[PDB]
TrEMBL record, chain A:
Protein name stated in the entry: Toxin-coregulated pilus biosynthesis protein B
Name of the encoding gene: tcpB
Lineage: Bacteria, Pseudomonadati, Pseudomonadota, Gammaproteobacteria, Vibrionales
From TrEMBL, chain B:
Protein name: Toxin-coregulated pilus biosynthesis protein B
Top-level division of the source organism's lineage: Bacteria
Length: 198, 131
């Protein structure tokens, strides 16, 4: 905030370092799509998926699957849902890095044939790493500050006493009109106090 | 260690909630939820969960995309995902509908009343399913 009287939201301590242990943090690869934020001009893109890499420095390559199983078990223990766990070989790129060869965790542990083919392509210029993939989906939480916008054509709904009938509304755009519409036609009656139009 | 009873249950809640999320959406990626374009009172979705995977994956699922593969694609489960594992093995989900006419989407012909997701117990003793 700038103001040192306020509680500062943070993610990691200042001295924090996670380039330690059997699975050593290597960096994170973000992929974006171009986006236009409805109320914040500083926002020009939105996150599609996050993949965080942890290189295995164990002496035996075959044990990364064992070390990985503990990570996945520890994730389910602490209530963290990830989207896709994978064993990867990464090489430096012009910008970040790119994935030369990859194998899913389930295939790495249940198919020794596929396992050694993957460990075979593990050469001196590639780094063996765990691929933890996040996917920014519709599950993103709406904040009381409104910084998070709804997805296009998504519907805000209420439980009604009709049982399991939903009474929704949304802000739709009609390109065949170039006009924004606040659609309440799912609700039977809208009862206001004051009311003004243009 | 027998904490795979908690590790199996977590997969059950994660998948069931994604089935609940799917069941509550009228539109997915600016396209109608494919399960709402029919009029029958009951439909069973298979355990392979291809119906819950995106269409743009190596094996085509049933969930629609925008078409433009540069846009952010909302998804429910990863494409290599399989929840027919563990003591509680995913067996499928039973949807019950009523016919419904949407005020702004003519492709919607039914609304979801209740979704029940089944997990067959392949545990050692049937008496342990309560556990």
């Amino acid at each position: 905030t700038g103001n040192n009287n306020d509680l500062q939201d943070q993610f990691i301590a200042c001295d924090a370092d996670y380039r330690k242990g059997d699975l050593s943090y290597f960096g994170s690869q973000f992929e974006f799509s171009t986006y236009v934020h409805p109320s914040n001009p500083e926002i020009q893109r939105q996150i599609k998926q996050v993949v965080s890499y942890f290189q295995y420095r164990g002496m035996e390559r075959a044990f990364i699957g064992d070390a990985a199983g503990y990570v996945i078990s520890e994730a389910k223990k602490k209530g963290f849902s990830a989207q896709d766990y994978r064993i990867v070989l990464i090489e430096p790129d012009r910008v970040g890095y790119f994935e030369s060869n990859a194998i899913s965790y389930e295939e790495f542990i249940e198919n020794p044939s596929a396992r050694e083919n993957f460990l075979l392509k593990a050469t001196k210029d590639r780094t063996l790493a765990l691929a933890v993939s996040l996917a920014q989906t519709g599950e993103i939480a709406m904040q009381r500050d409104g910084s998070v916008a709804f997805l296009e054509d998504s519907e805000l709904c209420w439980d009604t006493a009709a049982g399991s009938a939903k009474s929704c509304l949304s802000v739709r755009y009609d390109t065949v009109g170039n006009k924004t519409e606040l659609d309440l036609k799912q609700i039977d009656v809208v009862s206001a106090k004051g009311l003004s139009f243009e | 260690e027998l904490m795979i009873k908690s590790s199996n249950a977590f997969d059950v809640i994660e998948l069931s909630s994604q089935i609940q999320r799917y069941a509550s959406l009228s539109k997915i990626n600016n396209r109608t939820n494919p399960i709402l374009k029919d009029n029958k009172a009951k439909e069973f979705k298979d355990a392979d969960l291809k119906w819950l995977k995106l269409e743009n994956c190596p094996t085509a699922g049933d969930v629609p995309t925008t078409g433009n593969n540069n846009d952010l694609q909302d998804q429910f489960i990863a494409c290599d995902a399989d929840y027919r594992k563990g003591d509680l093995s995913y067996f499928g989900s039973q949807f019950e509908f009523s016919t419904y006419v949407h005020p702004s989407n003519p492709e919607i012909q039914r609304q979801i009343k209740q979704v029940v997701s089944y997990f067959q117990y392949r545990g050692m003793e049937r008496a342990f399913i309560g556990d």
